[PDB]
């Protein structure tokens, strides 16, 4: 069977970036031509591989991570980047081998008055390790004052809603991101190209 790339790219709802979804794609034939020749994508950057060279390569596993962020934040989905998203939500390794794909989803993920259902982690004690996920919602203590609950001025609920509005500037509009992670372990190669 052909790889189910359409399940990831064309899903109706994407996860919040702090709870990014990972889809393992294995034991299938991957026609990467549908992806690069789509022209509907606003970002298609690969690291360490070319899309043309990917049609003729094989890999043990291919992971497809997907989420929604702001347009101005897509630049953080790249190796060696800093910022709220890369530090606290989704971290790519410095030696990342794979592709980062994003498109504008303002038509799908914005709401008049705001879409509060997409969130990102704004507070965290330590930066994330590559491909680490954190979906906890413990109250964050920002000062030297203890935190009973969020009731303090320095006690924060750690997630933050984007509140996507259709009339946002393009940089603030929601973008759907799919991160293709190509893994080649010393094991049978289950994913190949046409």
């Amino acid at each position, epitope marked *: 069977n052909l790889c189910p790339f359409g399940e990831v790219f064309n899903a109706t709802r994407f996860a919040s970036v702090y709870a990014w979804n990972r889809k393992r794609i294995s034991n299938c034939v991957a026609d990467y031509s549908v992806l690069y020749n789509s022209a509907s994508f606003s970002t298609f950057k690969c690291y360490g591989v070319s899309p043309t060279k990917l049609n003729d390569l094989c890999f043990t596993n291919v992971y497809a991570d997907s989420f929604v962020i702001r347009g101005d934040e897509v630049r953080q989905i790249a190796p060696g980047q800093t910022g709220k998203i890369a530090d606290y939500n989704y971290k790519l390794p410095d030696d990342f081998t794979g592709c980062v794909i994003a498109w504008n989803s303002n038509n799908l993920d914005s709401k008049v008055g705001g879409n509060y259902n997409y969130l990102y982690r704004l507070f965290r004690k330590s930066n994330l390790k590559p491909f680490e996920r954190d979906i906890s919602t413990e109250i964050y203590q920002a000062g030297s004052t203890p935190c009973n609950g969020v*009731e*303090g001025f320095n006690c924060y609920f750690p997630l933050q809603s984007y509140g996507f509005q259709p009339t946002n500037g393009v940089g603030y509009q929601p973008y759907r991101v799919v991160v293709l992670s190509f893994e080649l372990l010393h094991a049978p190669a289950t994913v190949c190209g046409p």
Partner: nanobody
Amino acid sequence: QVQLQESGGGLVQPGGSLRLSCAVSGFTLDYYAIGWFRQAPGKEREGVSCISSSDGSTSYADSVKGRFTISRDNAKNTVYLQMNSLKPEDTALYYCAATPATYYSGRYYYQCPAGGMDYWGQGTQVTVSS
């Protein structure tokens, strides 16, 4: 569309008072928080007070608690900061900011995180003479 504009400020002697205003225009978010922040020379911009758009709940930094009052006139959609009993350490550039409330598990949170305010004003200087 969205714009926050500060007014008020200036020079006062210690013990004096000021009233800052923040005109919020073009705002369409259903639920949001509006906060006053300040940045003293060489220091990091810190939050001073925060107010909810839904019921006017307020929170204050410890350094200003009891002296500063944040309030909102929903008619004019203007947020005010009444600053009483001013001290030299209150000297800073003062900003108002707005950010959406956060929805999680059936509940909205109204927070004014200095590092996550989607909309900022231009800032107005406040100088307490000493």
